[PDB]
């Protein structure tokens, strides 16, 4: 293809809205008409009316914070073995991040659904009702400790 | 990339002048006056192009009425016979044969006094 004639496809050009005209868009600039319109209508999300919002809900969802804030206990993240059959061997968190899971959430636990290739998976924990689902396969050593 | 007005705003005011030709005083040289009286025209011309028939629709009848009453009968009594004769011809204009040879129309009259009396 030469330099010109490489136009776009279709359904993609901008032609944005130009509401300063005389029969295209209206002489009130689109979504305006009544009044109280030049700056803003406050935030139509959490507010407006001036009644009581809908913040009238109760926030029991506790442990809403202290002072030093969060605390460093490790995030246990699980992983469904459905695609653990994509590979095989002494699979370790070391590469499970390289595959496309965990992502330094760290502390890998295995669980899930499906046939498991008797592939000996080393991790930090295993779901019981899946561990016998592994017991009919191979071997599963545990993490270091805590 | 600035894009001043320039050509655009003038040429338009020249077109309104172009249609405001012969309009009294400021109504043809002052722009936003010429804009106005053009609004009424296109409206005045609209309605009247709907009206020009009713004008002639009326005129024809009087001439017709002028003719029938020169035989001795009214327009109301004239038309019925023609209609009784079932003659979807008479375009109320084409009944202008009162100075376009009359016997052609004078003997349309007697073909009316038939089917009614």
């Amino acid at each position: 293809d030469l330099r010109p004639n490489p136009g776009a496809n279709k359904r993609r050009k901008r032609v944005g809205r130009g509401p300063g005209s005389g029969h295209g868009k209206t002489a009130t600039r689109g979504h305006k008409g009544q009044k109280s319109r030049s700056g803003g209508l406050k935030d139509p999300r959490r507010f407006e009316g001036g009644r009581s919002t809908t913040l009238m809900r109760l926030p029991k969802r506790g442990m809403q914070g202290q002072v030093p804030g969060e605390i460093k206990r490790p995030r246990y993240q699980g992983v469904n073995l459905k695609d653990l059959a994509r590979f095989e061997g002494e699979v370790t968190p070391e590469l499970l991040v390289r595959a496309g899971l965990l992502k330094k959430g760290y502390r890998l636990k295995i669980l899930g659904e499906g046939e498991a290739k008797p592939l000996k998976v080393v991790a930090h924990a295993f779901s019981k009702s899946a561990l016998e689902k592994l017991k009919a396969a191979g071997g599963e050593p545990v993490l270091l400790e805590a | 990339p600035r894009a001043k007005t320039g050509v655009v705003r003038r040429r338009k005011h020249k077109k309104i002048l172009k249609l405001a030709k012969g309009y009294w005083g400021l109504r043809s040289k002052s722009f936003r006056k010429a804009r106005e009286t053009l609004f009424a025209a296109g409206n005045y011309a609209y309605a009247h192009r709907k009206r020009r028939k009713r004008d002639f629709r009326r005129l024809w009848i009087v001439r017709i009425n002028a003719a029938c009453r020169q035989h001795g009968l009214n327009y109301s009594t004239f038309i019925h016979g023609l209609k009784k004769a079932g003659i979807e011809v008479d375009r109320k204009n084409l009944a202008d044969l009162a100075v376009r040879e009359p016997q052609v129309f004078a003997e349309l009259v007697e073909r009316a006094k038939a089917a009614q009396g």
Binding site: D1, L2, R3, P6, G7, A8, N9, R12 | P1
Partner: protein
Amino acid sequence: MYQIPVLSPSGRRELAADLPAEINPHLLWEVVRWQLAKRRRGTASTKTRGEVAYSGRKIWPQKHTGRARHGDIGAPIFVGGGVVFGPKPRDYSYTLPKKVRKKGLAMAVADRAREGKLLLVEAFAGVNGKTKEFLAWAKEAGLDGSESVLLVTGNELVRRAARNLPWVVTLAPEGLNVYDIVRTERLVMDLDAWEVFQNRIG
């Protein structure tokens, strides 16, 4: 597609291409644009009613005045005051995914192969610096000034031998800008390129 020409130091032979040869222009169209906005140096500006030198003082009271109502003279309704929504300086660049230019690099190269408008080279009567020491090389190779040409080589001598060529634009082995490729109507490159272009994809 598969087949490509080469001017060896010992004759005219060919080679087999490892290169996908499908097409999608809305990719290239969506790549040229990137190359062209990223080279846009952000410079345009006007001045809002704050960067204007006029003061901030009402011109005449609105009550009991006869005229209208007004204020400071930076007001865009006046004249010479402030700009409305002027074009303060800003970047136009972004971050187009590499997988669009990588594939976008390949697509265009086969486009010249698909039309034959290609040539890998290796032999040069112009391995030194002279514009005359090249145009005869083009004569003995097949470039008669009819149509444009992009050139790639890792030798800063041949560039000299054509950097003054209106129909031949210089290009280092690396920035194979899809702009200049599609810009020029024919392409030339070397192995010194066809190892990095290969290390990109190949």
